[PDB]
Amino acid sequence: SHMEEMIRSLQQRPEPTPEEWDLIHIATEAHRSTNAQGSHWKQRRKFLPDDIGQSPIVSMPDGDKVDLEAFSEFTKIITPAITRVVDFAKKLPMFSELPCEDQIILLKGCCMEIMSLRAAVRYDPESDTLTLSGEMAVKREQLKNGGLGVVSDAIFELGKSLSAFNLDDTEVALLQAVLLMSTDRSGLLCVDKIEKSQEAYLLAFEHYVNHRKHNIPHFWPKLLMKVTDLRMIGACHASRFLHMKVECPTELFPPLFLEVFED
Ligand SMILES: N[C@@H](Cc1cc(I)c(Oc2ccc(O)c(I)c2)c(I)c1)C(=O)O
Ligand SMILES: N[C@@H](Cc1cc(I)c(Oc2ccc(O)c(I)c2)c(I)c1)C(=O)O
């Protein structure tokens, strides 16, 4: 119609449908309500003491040793972080309608990818830090030494690169939904349904990116490459986590940390 054309005049690319907007809204709010500190993180966060995370002392196969005190500081806050990822997922109808067993497999599969993304989007260029759970600002050396090794470097590089993308809450939430609804896991019951849901999220996300009209070119494929980086981060972490368990006693690992990162 005449009105439709007028308002779509500076549009070419497909916008989200009404159905996709509903999808977008629900996921955005699911993320906002489960993202620690929300909009206030920069003010409310405290730096991890400079004297912590400078003392790698426990051996690892790749030679990047672990600072036990720093590892402990990190693991002490990881349970509420994992919990919020579970909280986010439960708020998406296409996730909550899956069998309980599939939900668990999907959460285990994407948990590090999502937490890494949530750290990365809170990279602060001025202090050169990530913020963990909206409350703990950490330097590259600290996060490296406290257990992550080269995974820290990868997350910092992702965070630095994401600054220019200027992602909003919706884009972060849709990335999380896409990571969550991956069928690259063993033992799933409802593979076709999960794939259909990821396809629905991907198309809604592509259309939202169109709606946003970012100033950087090739935004959509660029964002997809970032998903691939997040996958590599998740994989490197899973491998390193196996080594952590070989080296250190169970008592240093919070129960949920152990459960979610099971091989
Ligand atoms: N910042 C995120 C939560 C988040 C919390 C923590 I502790 C993180 O560090 C990790 C992760 C895995 C590990 O094995 C180790 I050792 C340290 C990261 I990366 C992210 C959020 O806002 O939800
Ligand atoms: N179900 C799929 C959906 C999906 C499919 C494709 I093709 C993607 O682009 C890729 C993938 C791997 C690469 O090496 C490169 I370069 C680009 C992405 I990002 C996601 C998934 O969850 O990955």
PDB file of C-alpha atoms and ligand atoms in Angstrom:
ATOM      1  CA  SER A   1       0.000   0.000   0.000  1.00  0.00           C
ATOM      2  CA  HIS A   2       0.903   3.690  -0.269  1.00  0.00           C
ATOM      3  CA  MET A   3       1.785   3.971   3.428  1.00  0.00           C
ATOM      4  CA  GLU A   4       3.745   0.736   3.428  1.00  0.00           C
ATOM      5  CA  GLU A   5       5.813   1.998   0.550  1.00  0.00           C
ATOM      6  CA  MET A   6       6.505   5.344   2.090  1.00  0.00           C
ATOM      7  CA  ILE A   7       7.888   3.933   5.262  1.00  0.00           C
ATOM      8  CA  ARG A   8       9.888   1.236   3.492  1.00  0.00           C
ATOM      9  CA  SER A   9      11.334   3.797   1.058  1.00  0.00           C
ATOM     10  CA  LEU A  10      14.855   3.802   2.491  1.00  0.00           C
ATOM     11  CA  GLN A  11      14.638   0.019   2.890  1.00  0.00           C
ATOM     12  CA  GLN A  12      15.500  -2.612   0.535  1.00  0.00           C
ATOM     13  CA  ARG A  13      16.527  -5.515   2.605  1.00  0.00           C
ATOM     14  CA  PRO A  14      14.029  -7.809   4.250  1.00  0.00           C
ATOM     15  CA  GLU A  15      12.804  -6.629   7.639  1.00  0.00           C
ATOM     16  CA  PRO A  16      11.654  -8.977  10.385  1.00  0.00           C
ATOM     17  CA  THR A  17       8.094 -10.248   9.944  1.00  0.00           C
ATOM     18  CA  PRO A  18       5.591  -9.702  12.776  1.00  0.00           C
ATOM     19  CA  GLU A  19       6.304 -13.297  13.871  1.00  0.00           C
ATOM     20  CA  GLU A  20      10.040 -12.644  13.851  1.00  0.00           C
ATOM     21  CA  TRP A  21       9.555  -9.450  15.881  1.00  0.00           C
ATOM     22  CA  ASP A  22       7.782 -11.530  18.546  1.00  0.00           C
ATOM     23  CA  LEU A  23      10.724 -13.945  18.463  1.00  0.00           C
ATOM     24  CA  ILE A  24      13.149 -11.017  18.727  1.00  0.00           C
ATOM     25  CA  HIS A  25      11.294  -9.387  21.617  1.00  0.00           C
ATOM     26  CA  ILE A  26      11.084 -12.552  23.728  1.00  0.00           C
ATOM     27  CA  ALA A  27      14.777 -13.375  23.223  1.00  0.00           C
ATOM     28  CA  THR A  28      15.880  -9.781  23.892  1.00  0.00           C
ATOM     29  CA  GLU A  29      14.002  -9.682  27.193  1.00  0.00           C
ATOM     30  CA  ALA A  30      15.206 -13.164  28.137  1.00  0.00           C
ATOM     31  CA  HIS A  31      18.802 -11.894  27.764  1.00  0.00           C
ATOM     32  CA  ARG A  32      18.249  -8.545  29.467  1.00  0.00           C
ATOM     33  CA  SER A  33      16.659 -10.189  32.505  1.00  0.00           C
ATOM     34  CA  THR A  34      19.534 -12.659  32.875  1.00  0.00           C
ATOM     35  CA  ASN A  35      22.535 -10.443  32.025  1.00  0.00           C
ATOM     36  CA  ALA A  36      24.335  -9.442  35.247  1.00  0.00           C
ATOM     37  CA  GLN A  37      24.177  -5.726  36.206  1.00  0.00           C
ATOM     38  CA  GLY A  38      22.664  -4.833  32.875  1.00  0.00           C
ATOM     39  CA  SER A  39      23.504  -1.322  31.893  1.00  0.00           C
ATOM     40  CA  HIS A  40      25.444  -0.417  35.020  1.00  0.00           C
ATOM     41  CA  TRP A  41      28.326  -2.816  34.763  1.00  0.00           C
ATOM     42  CA  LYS A  42      30.976  -0.241  34.046  1.00  0.00           C
ATOM     43  CA  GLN A  43      30.272   1.670  37.270  1.00  0.00           C
ATOM     44  CA  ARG A  44      29.559  -1.304  39.542  1.00  0.00           C
ATOM     45  CA  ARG A  45      32.479  -3.511  38.615  1.00  0.00           C
ATOM     46  CA  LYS A  46      35.643  -3.834  40.682  1.00  0.00           C
ATOM     47  CA  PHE A  47      39.037  -4.809  39.417  1.00  0.00           C
ATOM     48  CA  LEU A  48      40.604  -8.077  40.389  1.00  0.00           C
ATOM     49  CA  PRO A  49      43.537  -7.073  42.633  1.00  0.00           C
ATOM     50  CA  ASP A  50      46.759  -6.514  40.661  1.00  0.00           C
ATOM     51  CA  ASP A  51      48.637  -8.982  42.888  1.00  0.00           C
ATOM     52  CA  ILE A  52      46.294 -11.807  41.954  1.00  0.00           C
ATOM     53  CA  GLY A  53      46.790 -13.742  38.730  1.00  0.00           C
ATOM     54  CA  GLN A  54      50.523 -13.088  38.339  1.00  0.00           C
ATOM     55  CA  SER A  55      51.759 -16.418  39.702  1.00  0.00           C
ATOM     56  CA  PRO A  56      51.222 -19.478  37.504  1.00  0.00           C
ATOM     57  CA  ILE A  57      52.315 -22.434  39.611  1.00  0.00           C
ATOM     58  CA  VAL A  58      50.362 -25.560  38.604  1.00  0.00           C
ATOM     59  CA  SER A  59      51.539 -27.436  35.477  1.00  0.00           C
ATOM     60  CA  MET A  60      49.420 -27.904  32.354  1.00  0.00           C
ATOM     61  CA  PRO A  61      50.302 -29.963  29.294  1.00  0.00           C
ATOM     62  CA  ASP A  62      50.582 -26.994  26.948  1.00  0.00           C
ATOM     63  CA  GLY A  63      52.983 -25.236  29.296  1.00  0.00           C
ATOM     64  CA  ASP A  64      50.664 -22.402  30.326  1.00  0.00           C
ATOM     65  CA  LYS A  65      50.644 -22.945  34.076  1.00  0.00           C
ATOM     66  CA  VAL A  66      47.770 -22.086  36.413  1.00  0.00           C
ATOM     67  CA  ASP A  67      47.763 -19.535  39.233  1.00  0.00           C
ATOM     68  CA  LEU A  68      45.751 -21.434  41.854  1.00  0.00           C
ATOM     69  CA  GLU A  69      44.590 -18.359  43.781  1.00  0.00           C
ATOM     70  CA  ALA A  70      43.311 -16.741  40.598  1.00  0.00           C
ATOM     71  CA  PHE A  71      41.597 -19.969  39.486  1.00  0.00           C
ATOM     72  CA  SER A  72      39.804 -19.997  42.848  1.00  0.00           C
ATOM     73  CA  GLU A  73      38.667 -16.384  42.466  1.00  0.00           C
ATOM     74  CA  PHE A  74      37.277 -17.202  39.018  1.00  0.00           C
ATOM     75  CA  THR A  75      35.537 -20.434  39.997  1.00  0.00           C
ATOM     76  CA  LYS A  76      34.027 -18.741  43.056  1.00  0.00           C
ATOM     77  CA  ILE A  77      31.823 -16.617  40.791  1.00  0.00           C
ATOM     78  CA  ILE A  78      31.244 -19.091  37.952  1.00  0.00           C
ATOM     79  CA  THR A  79      28.195 -20.882  39.408  1.00  0.00           C
ATOM     80  CA  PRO A  80      25.854 -17.862  39.284  1.00  0.00           C
ATOM     81  CA  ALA A  81      27.159 -17.135  35.774  1.00  0.00           C
ATOM     82  CA  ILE A  82      26.333 -20.615  34.487  1.00  0.00           C
ATOM     83  CA  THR A  83      22.973 -20.387  36.249  1.00  0.00           C
ATOM     84  CA  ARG A  84      22.059 -17.221  34.351  1.00  0.00           C
ATOM     85  CA  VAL A  85      22.759 -18.929  31.016  1.00  0.00           C
ATOM     86  CA  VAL A  86      20.350 -21.679  32.092  1.00  0.00           C
ATOM     87  CA  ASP A  87      17.871 -18.958  33.119  1.00  0.00           C
ATOM     88  CA  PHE A  88      18.125 -17.341  29.679  1.00  0.00           C
ATOM     89  CA  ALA A  89      17.575 -20.604  27.795  1.00  0.00           C
ATOM     90  CA  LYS A  90      14.561 -21.535  29.918  1.00  0.00           C
ATOM     91  CA  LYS A  91      12.926 -18.278  28.880  1.00  0.00           C
ATOM     92  CA  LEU A  92      12.899 -19.220  25.168  1.00  0.00           C
ATOM     93  CA  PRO A  93       9.748 -21.215  24.296  1.00  0.00           C
ATOM     94  CA  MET A  94      11.499 -23.246  21.583  1.00  0.00           C
ATOM     95  CA  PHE A  95      14.053 -24.356  24.153  1.00  0.00           C
ATOM     96  CA  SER A  96      11.698 -24.986  27.075  1.00  0.00           C
ATOM     97  CA  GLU A  97       9.413 -27.163  24.926  1.00  0.00           C
ATOM     98  CA  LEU A  98      12.270 -29.619  24.236  1.00  0.00           C
ATOM     99  CA  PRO A  99      12.685 -32.871  26.215  1.00  0.00           C
ATOM    100  CA  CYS A 100      14.528 -32.300  29.502  1.00  0.00           C
ATOM    101  CA  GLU A 101      17.401 -34.437  28.240  1.00  0.00           C
ATOM    102  CA  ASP A 102      17.837 -32.353  25.077  1.00  0.00           C
ATOM    103  CA  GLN A 103      17.792 -29.123  27.072  1.00  0.00           C
ATOM    104  CA  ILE A 104      20.708 -30.367  29.174  1.00  0.00           C
ATOM    105  CA  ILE A 105      22.742 -31.458  26.157  1.00  0.00           C
ATOM    106  CA  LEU A 106      22.206 -28.078  24.450  1.00  0.00           C
ATOM    107  CA  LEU A 107      23.181 -26.127  27.585  1.00  0.00           C
ATOM    108  CA  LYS A 108      26.376 -28.156  28.024  1.00  0.00           C
ATOM    109  CA  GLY A 109      27.194 -27.626  24.354  1.00  0.00           C
ATOM    110  CA  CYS A 110      26.935 -23.813  24.293  1.00  0.00           C
ATOM    111  CA  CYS A 111      27.636 -22.713  27.863  1.00  0.00           C
ATOM    112  CA  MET A 112      31.233 -21.526  27.403  1.00  0.00           C
ATOM    113  CA  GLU A 113      30.372 -19.936  24.026  1.00  0.00           C
ATOM    114  CA  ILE A 114      27.668 -17.864  25.698  1.00  0.00           C
ATOM    115  CA  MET A 115      29.645 -16.889  28.787  1.00  0.00           C
ATOM    116  CA  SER A 116      32.608 -15.914  26.579  1.00  0.00           C
ATOM    117  CA  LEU A 117      30.369 -13.775  24.438  1.00  0.00           C
ATOM    118  CA  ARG A 118      28.920 -12.082  27.538  1.00  0.00           C
ATOM    119  CA  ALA A 119      32.468 -11.345  28.720  1.00  0.00           C
ATOM    120  CA  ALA A 120      33.585 -10.164  25.285  1.00  0.00           C
ATOM    121  CA  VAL A 121      30.779  -7.643  24.783  1.00  0.00           C
ATOM    122  CA  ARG A 122      31.906  -6.073  28.058  1.00  0.00           C
ATOM    123  CA  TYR A 123      35.446  -5.489  26.884  1.00  0.00           C
ATOM    124  CA  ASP A 124      36.585  -2.000  27.956  1.00  0.00           C
ATOM    125  CA  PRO A 125      39.144  -0.442  25.578  1.00  0.00           C
ATOM    126  CA  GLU A 126      40.231   2.248  28.056  1.00  0.00           C
ATOM    127  CA  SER A 127      41.378  -0.208  30.745  1.00  0.00           C
ATOM    128  CA  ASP A 128      41.995  -3.137  28.377  1.00  0.00           C
ATOM    129  CA  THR A 129      39.867  -5.461  30.553  1.00  0.00           C
ATOM    130  CA  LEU A 130      36.984  -7.907  30.229  1.00  0.00           C
ATOM    131  CA  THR A 131      34.253  -7.825  32.879  1.00  0.00           C
ATOM    132  CA  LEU A 132      33.151 -11.162  34.305  1.00  0.00           C
ATOM    133  CA  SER A 133      29.485 -11.313  35.424  1.00  0.00           C
ATOM    134  CA  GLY A 134      29.233  -7.534  35.185  1.00  0.00           C
ATOM    135  CA  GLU A 135      31.235  -7.309  38.411  1.00  0.00           C
ATOM    136  CA  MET A 136      34.880  -8.418  38.073  1.00  0.00           C
ATOM    137  CA  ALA A 137      37.193  -6.522  35.733  1.00  0.00           C
ATOM    138  CA  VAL A 138      40.134  -8.681  34.665  1.00  0.00           C
ATOM    139  CA  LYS A 139      43.339  -8.076  32.719  1.00  0.00           C
ATOM    140  CA  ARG A 140      44.650 -10.370  29.952  1.00  0.00           C
ATOM    141  CA  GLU A 141      47.416 -11.801  32.155  1.00  0.00           C
ATOM    142  CA  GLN A 142      45.048 -12.510  35.044  1.00  0.00           C
ATOM    143  CA  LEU A 143      42.473 -14.410  33.004  1.00  0.00           C
ATOM    144  CA  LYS A 144      45.262 -16.265  31.172  1.00  0.00           C
ATOM    145  CA  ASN A 145      47.038 -17.299  34.381  1.00  0.00           C
ATOM    146  CA  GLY A 146      43.878 -18.175  36.309  1.00  0.00           C
ATOM    147  CA  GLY A 147      43.138 -21.176  34.110  1.00  0.00           C
ATOM    148  CA  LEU A 148      42.085 -20.112  30.623  1.00  0.00           C
ATOM    149  CA  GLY A 149      45.587 -19.959  29.117  1.00  0.00           C
ATOM    150  CA  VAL A 150      45.431 -18.976  25.425  1.00  0.00           C
ATOM    151  CA  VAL A 151      41.624 -19.061  25.627  1.00  0.00           C
ATOM    152  CA  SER A 152      41.918 -15.693  27.437  1.00  0.00           C
ATOM    153  CA  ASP A 153      43.827 -14.203  24.487  1.00  0.00           C
ATOM    154  CA  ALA A 154      41.092 -15.427  22.131  1.00  0.00           C
ATOM    155  CA  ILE A 155      38.292 -13.883  24.184  1.00  0.00           C
ATOM    156  CA  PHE A 156      40.128 -10.577  24.532  1.00  0.00           C
ATOM    157  CA  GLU A 157      40.733 -10.512  20.769  1.00  0.00           C
ATOM    158  CA  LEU A 158      37.042 -11.200  20.178  1.00  0.00           C
ATOM    159  CA  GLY A 159      36.078  -8.477  22.650  1.00  0.00           C
ATOM    160  CA  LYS A 160      38.419  -5.934  21.058  1.00  0.00           C
ATOM    161  CA  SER A 161      37.051  -6.720  17.609  1.00  0.00           C
ATOM    162  CA  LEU A 162      33.410  -6.564  18.715  1.00  0.00           C
ATOM    163  CA  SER A 163      33.725  -2.945  19.897  1.00  0.00           C
ATOM    164  CA  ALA A 164      33.314  -1.682  16.331  1.00  0.00           C
ATOM    165  CA  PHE A 165      30.216  -3.821  15.787  1.00  0.00           C
ATOM    166  CA  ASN A 166      28.271  -1.832  18.408  1.00  0.00           C
ATOM    167  CA  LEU A 167      26.019  -4.796  19.180  1.00  0.00           C
ATOM    168  CA  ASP A 168      22.770  -4.044  20.995  1.00  0.00           C
ATOM    169  CA  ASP A 169      20.964  -6.284  23.513  1.00  0.00           C
ATOM    170  CA  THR A 170      18.897  -7.845  20.755  1.00  0.00           C
ATOM    171  CA  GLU A 171      21.933  -8.833  18.689  1.00  0.00           C
ATOM    172  CA  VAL A 172      23.644 -10.386  21.714  1.00  0.00           C
ATOM    173  CA  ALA A 173      20.481 -12.299  22.632  1.00  0.00           C
ATOM    174  CA  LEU A 174      19.994 -13.632  19.110  1.00  0.00           C
ATOM    175  CA  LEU A 175      23.635 -14.718  18.939  1.00  0.00           C
ATOM    176  CA  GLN A 176      22.985 -16.594  22.200  1.00  0.00           C
ATOM    177  CA  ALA A 177      19.838 -18.221  20.775  1.00  0.00           C
ATOM    178  CA  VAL A 178      21.734 -19.327  17.687  1.00  0.00           C
ATOM    179  CA  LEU A 179      24.589 -20.811  19.767  1.00  0.00           C
ATOM    180  CA  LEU A 180      22.045 -22.563  22.008  1.00  0.00           C
ATOM    181  CA  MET A 181      20.053 -24.182  19.203  1.00  0.00           C
ATOM    182  CA  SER A 182      22.977 -26.021  17.574  1.00  0.00           C
ATOM    183  CA  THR A 183      22.595 -29.699  16.760  1.00  0.00           C
ATOM    184  CA  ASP A 184      26.322 -30.430  16.738  1.00  0.00           C
ATOM    185  CA  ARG A 185      26.030 -32.532  19.908  1.00  0.00           C
ATOM    186  CA  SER A 186      25.608 -36.243  20.493  1.00  0.00           C
ATOM    187  CA  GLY A 187      22.501 -37.811  21.971  1.00  0.00           C
ATOM    188  CA  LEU A 188      19.792 -35.326  20.977  1.00  0.00           C
ATOM    189  CA  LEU A 189      16.260 -36.600  20.589  1.00  0.00           C
ATOM    190  CA  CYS A 190      14.629 -33.764  18.698  1.00  0.00           C
ATOM    191  CA  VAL A 191      17.252 -32.906  16.111  1.00  0.00           C
ATOM    192  CA  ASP A 192      14.879 -31.732  13.359  1.00  0.00           C
ATOM    193  CA  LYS A 193      12.926 -29.520  15.752  1.00  0.00           C
ATOM    194  CA  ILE A 194      16.099 -27.964  17.115  1.00  0.00           C
ATOM    195  CA  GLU A 195      17.366 -27.271  13.584  1.00  0.00           C
ATOM    196  CA  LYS A 196      14.054 -25.666  12.607  1.00  0.00           C
ATOM    197  CA  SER A 197      14.280 -23.426  15.659  1.00  0.00           C
ATOM    198  CA  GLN A 198      17.841 -22.383  14.899  1.00  0.00           C
ATOM    199  CA  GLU A 199      16.811 -21.660  11.300  1.00  0.00           C
ATOM    200  CA  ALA A 200      13.961 -19.475  12.601  1.00  0.00           C
ATOM    201  CA  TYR A 201      16.365 -17.576  14.878  1.00  0.00           C
ATOM    202  CA  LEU A 202      18.996 -17.156  12.147  1.00  0.00           C
ATOM    203  CA  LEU A 203      16.505 -15.670   9.682  1.00  0.00           C
ATOM    204  CA  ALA A 204      15.003 -13.371  12.344  1.00  0.00           C
ATOM    205  CA  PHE A 205      18.563 -12.326  13.267  1.00  0.00           C
ATOM    206  CA  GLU A 206      19.545 -11.671   9.636  1.00  0.00           C
ATOM    207  CA  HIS A 207      16.403  -9.548   9.228  1.00  0.00           C
ATOM    208  CA  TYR A 208      17.041  -7.656  12.476  1.00  0.00           C
ATOM    209  CA  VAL A 209      20.557  -6.865  11.267  1.00  0.00           C
ATOM    210  CA  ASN A 210      19.002  -5.423   8.123  1.00  0.00           C
ATOM    211  CA  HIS A 211      16.603  -3.351  10.230  1.00  0.00           C
ATOM    212  CA  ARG A 212      19.492  -1.920  12.248  1.00  0.00           C
ATOM    213  CA  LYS A 213      21.367  -0.490   9.242  1.00  0.00           C
ATOM    214  CA  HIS A 214      24.865  -0.666  10.816  1.00  0.00           C
ATOM    215  CA  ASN A 215      27.547   1.655   9.502  1.00  0.00           C
ATOM    216  CA  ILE A 216      30.075  -1.113   8.904  1.00  0.00           C
ATOM    217  CA  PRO A 217      29.792  -3.019   5.597  1.00  0.00           C
ATOM    218  CA  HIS A 218      29.132  -6.769   5.317  1.00  0.00           C
ATOM    219  CA  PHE A 219      27.790  -6.875   8.859  1.00  0.00           C
ATOM    220  CA  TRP A 220      25.928 -10.199   8.612  1.00  0.00           C
ATOM    221  CA  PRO A 221      28.745 -12.397   7.276  1.00  0.00           C
ATOM    222  CA  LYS A 222      31.127 -10.626   9.680  1.00  0.00           C
ATOM    223  CA  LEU A 223      28.853 -11.580  12.598  1.00  0.00           C
ATOM    224  CA  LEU A 224      28.715 -15.168  11.345  1.00  0.00           C
ATOM    225  CA  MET A 225      32.519 -15.330  11.348  1.00  0.00           C
ATOM    226  CA  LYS A 226      32.373 -14.214  15.010  1.00  0.00           C
ATOM    227  CA  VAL A 227      30.092 -17.146  15.777  1.00  0.00           C
ATOM    228  CA  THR A 228      32.829 -19.376  14.303  1.00  0.00           C
ATOM    229  CA  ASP A 229      35.393 -17.687  16.581  1.00  0.00           C
ATOM    230  CA  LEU A 230      33.150 -18.356  19.592  1.00  0.00           C
ATOM    231  CA  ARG A 231      32.971 -22.001  18.589  1.00  0.00           C
ATOM    232  CA  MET A 232      36.772 -22.207  18.510  1.00  0.00           C
ATOM    233  CA  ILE A 233      36.866 -20.610  21.972  1.00  0.00           C
ATOM    234  CA  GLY A 234      34.385 -23.191  23.272  1.00  0.00           C
ATOM    235  CA  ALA A 235      36.401 -26.029  21.777  1.00  0.00           C
ATOM    236  CA  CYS A 236      39.717 -24.781  23.156  1.00  0.00           C
ATOM    237  CA  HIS A 237      38.131 -24.436  26.553  1.00  0.00           C
ATOM    238  CA  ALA A 238      36.667 -27.955  26.512  1.00  0.00           C
ATOM    239  CA  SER A 239      40.119 -29.345  25.699  1.00  0.00           C
ATOM    240  CA  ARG A 240      41.806 -27.279  28.412  1.00  0.00           C
ATOM    241  CA  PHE A 241      39.133 -28.166  30.961  1.00  0.00           C
ATOM    242  CA  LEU A 242      39.909 -31.863  30.508  1.00  0.00           C
ATOM    243  CA  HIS A 243      43.523 -31.070  31.394  1.00  0.00           C
ATOM    244  CA  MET A 244      42.443 -29.016  34.439  1.00  0.00           C
ATOM    245  CA  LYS A 245      40.650 -32.085  35.772  1.00  0.00           C
ATOM    246  CA  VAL A 246      43.659 -34.339  35.224  1.00  0.00           C
ATOM    247  CA  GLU A 247      45.864 -31.913  37.193  1.00  0.00           C
ATOM    248  CA  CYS A 248      43.645 -30.676  40.029  1.00  0.00           C
ATOM    249  CA  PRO A 249      41.445 -32.258  42.712  1.00  0.00           C
ATOM    250  CA  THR A 250      37.639 -32.201  42.424  1.00  0.00           C
ATOM    251  CA  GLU A 251      37.329 -30.012  45.537  1.00  0.00           C
ATOM    252  CA  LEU A 252      38.567 -26.991  43.556  1.00  0.00           C
ATOM    253  CA  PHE A 253      35.723 -27.312  41.006  1.00  0.00           C
ATOM    254  CA  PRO A 254      32.197 -26.171  41.901  1.00  0.00           C
ATOM    255  CA  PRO A 255      29.651 -28.905  41.240  1.00  0.00           C
ATOM    256  CA  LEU A 256      27.872 -26.991  38.460  1.00  0.00           C
ATOM    257  CA  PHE A 257      31.174 -26.102  36.810  1.00  0.00           C
ATOM    258  CA  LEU A 258      32.010 -29.820  36.693  1.00  0.00           C
ATOM    259  CA  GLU A 259      28.589 -30.866  35.473  1.00  0.00           C
ATOM    260  CA  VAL A 260      28.280 -28.390  32.655  1.00  0.00           C
ATOM    261  CA  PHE A 261      31.746 -29.064  31.250  1.00  0.00           C
ATOM    262  CA  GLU A 262      31.463 -32.872  31.293  1.00  0.00           C
ATOM    263  CA  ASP A 263      33.100 -34.537  28.287  1.00  0.00           C
TER     264      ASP A 263
HETATM  265  N1  LIG B   1      31.162 -12.761  32.072  1.00  0.00           N
HETATM  266  C1  LIG B   1      30.236 -13.843  31.837  1.00  0.00           C
HETATM  267  C2  LIG B   1      30.427 -14.990  32.812  1.00  0.00           C
HETATM  268  C3  LIG B   1      31.839 -15.510  32.859  1.00  0.00           C
HETATM  269  C4  LIG B   1      32.346 -15.930  34.100  1.00  0.00           C
HETATM  270  C5  LIG B   1      33.634 -16.414  34.152  1.00  0.00           C
HETATM  271  I1  LIG B   1      34.363 -16.997  36.066  1.00  0.00           I
HETATM  272  C6  LIG B   1      34.418 -16.505  33.015  1.00  0.00           C
HETATM  273  O1  LIG B   1      35.710 -16.960  33.128  1.00  0.00           O
HETATM  274  C7  LIG B   1      35.963 -18.323  33.068  1.00  0.00           C
HETATM  275  C8  LIG B   1      35.256 -19.229  32.275  1.00  0.00           C
HETATM  276  C9  LIG B   1      35.608 -20.591  32.234  1.00  0.00           C
HETATM  277  C10 LIG B   1      36.698 -21.043  33.003  1.00  0.00           C
HETATM  278  O2  LIG B   1      37.113 -22.364  33.004  1.00  0.00           O
HETATM  279  C11 LIG B   1      37.380 -20.135  33.764  1.00  0.00           C
HETATM  280  I2  LIG B   1      39.030 -20.829  34.932  1.00  0.00           I
HETATM  281  C12 LIG B   1      37.048 -18.794  33.819  1.00  0.00           C
HETATM  282  C13 LIG B   1      33.947 -16.082  31.763  1.00  0.00           C
HETATM  283  I3  LIG B   1      35.159 -16.154  30.006  1.00  0.00           I
HETATM  284  C14 LIG B   1      32.636 -15.601  31.721  1.00  0.00           C
HETATM  285  C15 LIG B   1      28.859 -13.280  32.030  1.00  0.00           C
HETATM  286  O3  LIG B   1      28.681 -12.037  32.141  1.00  0.00           O
HETATM  287  O4  LIG B   1      27.869 -14.052  32.067  1.00  0.00           O
HETATM  288  N1  LIG B   2      23.635 -25.067  12.406  1.00  0.00           N
HETATM  289  C1  LIG B   2      24.794 -24.277  12.040  1.00  0.00           C
HETATM  290  C2  LIG B   2      24.337 -22.960  11.424  1.00  0.00           C
HETATM  291  C3  LIG B   2      25.505 -22.294  10.734  1.00  0.00           C
HETATM  292  C4  LIG B   2      25.801 -22.639   9.415  1.00  0.00           C
HETATM  293  C5  LIG B   2      26.865 -22.055   8.738  1.00  0.00           C
HETATM  294  I1  LIG B   2      27.289 -22.588   6.762  1.00  0.00           I
HETATM  295  C6  LIG B   2      27.695 -21.047   9.441  1.00  0.00           C
HETATM  296  O1  LIG B   2      28.755 -20.444   8.816  1.00  0.00           O
HETATM  297  C7  LIG B   2      30.008 -20.987   8.912  1.00  0.00           C
HETATM  298  C8  LIG B   2      30.187 -22.185   9.600  1.00  0.00           C
HETATM  299  C9  LIG B   2      31.444 -22.768   9.720  1.00  0.00           C
HETATM  300  C10 LIG B   2      32.549 -22.153   9.148  1.00  0.00           C
HETATM  301  O2  LIG B   2      33.786 -22.712   9.257  1.00  0.00           O
HETATM  302  C11 LIG B   2      32.361 -20.877   8.414  1.00  0.00           C
HETATM  303  I2  LIG B   2      33.992 -19.911   7.534  1.00  0.00           I
HETATM  304  C12 LIG B   2      31.086 -20.335   8.323  1.00  0.00           C
HETATM  305  C13 LIG B   2      27.342 -20.713  10.842  1.00  0.00           C
HETATM  306  I3  LIG B   2      28.456 -19.304  11.910  1.00  0.00           I
HETATM  307  C14 LIG B   2      26.258 -21.352  11.433  1.00  0.00           C
HETATM  308  C15 LIG B   2      25.617 -23.998  13.263  1.00  0.00           C
HETATM  309  O3  LIG B   2      25.052 -24.012  14.378  1.00  0.00           O
HETATM  310  O4  LIG B   2      26.836 -23.761  13.120  1.00  0.00           O
END
